[PDB]
Amino acid sequence: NFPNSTNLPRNPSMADYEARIFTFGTWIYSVNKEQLARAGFYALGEGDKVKCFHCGGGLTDWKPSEDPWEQHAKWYPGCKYLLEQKGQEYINNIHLTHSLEECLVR
Ligand SMILES: C[C@H]([NH3+])C(=O)Nc1cccc(N)n1
Ligand SMILES: [Zn+2]
């Protein structure tokens, strides 16, 4: 499934922060649910799997140190919600950062 790069959300029923929050229920996982919901994510109810309401990009297997906005930018860099909320520049920073990580341990 291709990532949505238009300015229109793939899932408008999940456009509201409050709607996204409800999807998690009791959350046992390593990354905080309010932080996930703030970065556009809602829970699928499949382990720690979340999906962005806008781009539809899915993410599983979250580690405790990992930041929702950073992962959002890393895997779904065409997301227009990400662009609106964080700005190109934050986005490029993240990309430069992860590319330089994926070079200094090699
Ligand atoms: C959040 C985790 N570190 C991660 O990168 N997860 C990921 C990446 C790409 C696809 C899917 N499903 N999950
Ligand atoms: Zn997105």
Curated annotation (Swiss-Prot):
It is found in: Cytoplasm; Nucleus. Expressed in colonic crypts (at protein level). Ubiquitous, except peripheral blood leukocytes. BIR repeats lie at residues 17-82. Zn(2+) binds at C52, C55, H72, C79. Residues 81-102 are annotated as: Required for interaction with DIABLO. There is a cross-link at K74, K80 (Glycyl lysine isopeptide (Lys-Gly) (interchain with G-Cter in ubiquitin)). Belongs to the IAP family. Multi-functional protein which regulates not only caspases and apoptosis, but also modulates inflammatory signaling and immunity, copper homeostasis, mitogenic kinase signaling, cell proliferation, as well as cell invasion and metastasis. Acts as a direct caspase inhibitor. Directly bind to the active site pocket of CASP3 and CASP7 and obstructs substrate entry. Inactivates CASP9 by keeping it in a monomeric, inactive state. Monomer, and homodimer. Part of a complex composed of SEPTIN4 isoform ARTS, XIAP and BCL2, within the complex interacts with SEPTIN4 isoform ARTS and BCL2, SEPTIN4 isoform ARTS acts as a scaffold protein and stabilizes the complex. Interacts (via BIR3 domain) with DIABLO/SMAC; the interaction inhibits apoptotic suppressor activity. Interacts with HTRA2/PRSS25; the interaction inhibits apoptotic suppressor activity. Interacts with TAB1/MAP3K7IP1 and AIFM1. Interaction with DIABLO/SMAC hinders binding of TAB1/MAP3K7IP1 and AIFM1. Interacts with TCF25 and COMMD1. This is E3 ubiquitin-protein ligase XIAP. The chain holds residues 249 to 354 of 497 of the full protein.
